[PDB]
Amino acid sequence: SMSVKKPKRDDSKDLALCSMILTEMETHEDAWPFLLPVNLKLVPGYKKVIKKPMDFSTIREKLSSGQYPNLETFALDVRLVFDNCETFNEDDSDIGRAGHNMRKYFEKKWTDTFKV
Numbered sequence: 557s558m559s560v561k562k563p564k565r566d567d568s569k570d571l572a573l574c575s576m577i578l579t580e581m582e583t584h585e586d587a588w589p590f591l592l593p594v595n596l597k598l599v600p601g602y603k604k605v606i607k608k609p610m611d612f613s614t615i616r617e618k619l620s621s622g623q624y625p626n627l628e629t630f631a632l633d634v635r636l637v638f639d640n641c642e643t644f645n646e647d648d649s650d651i652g653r654a655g656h657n658m659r660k661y662f663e664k665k666w667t668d669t670f671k672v
C-alpha cells in the first residue's frame with residue numbers, strides 16, 4: 557500500500573527474454589498455423605466466432621513497439637493464440653495438435669525463464 561514498498565523482481569531483462577521466447581516459438585516447426593493472422597476473408601466463421609484474434613506476428617509487432625506494459629500481458633496474448641486455436645479447431649486435427657504442442661512448448665519456456 558502507500559509507502560509500503562513490496563520487494564519486486566528485477567524486470568530489466570523481460571523485454572529481451574520475451575523476445576527470445578517469441579523467436580523460439582516462431583522457429584518451431586509446428587508454428588505455421590500461428591505465424592500470420594488468420595485470413596478473415598478466406599476462413600468462414602472465424603471473424604464472428606473469435607472475438608480477439610492473435611498471432612505471433614502481431615505479438616512480435618506489439619513487443620517491438622512497446623505495447624506490452626509487463627511480461628504478464630505478453631503471456632496473455634501468447635495464450636490467447638492457443639485458446640483461439642482450441643476454440644476453432646478439433647484436437648484431432650493438424651492445427652489442433654499444433655496448438656496443444658505449441659502451448660506446452662511455451663509454458664515450459666515461460667516457467668524455465670521466469671519462475672526461479
Ligand SMILES: Nc1ncnc2[nH]cnc12
Binds near residue numbers: 590595644645651
Ligand atoms: N488457418 C486457420 N484456420 C482456422 N483456424 C486456425 N487457427 C490457426 N490457424 C488457423
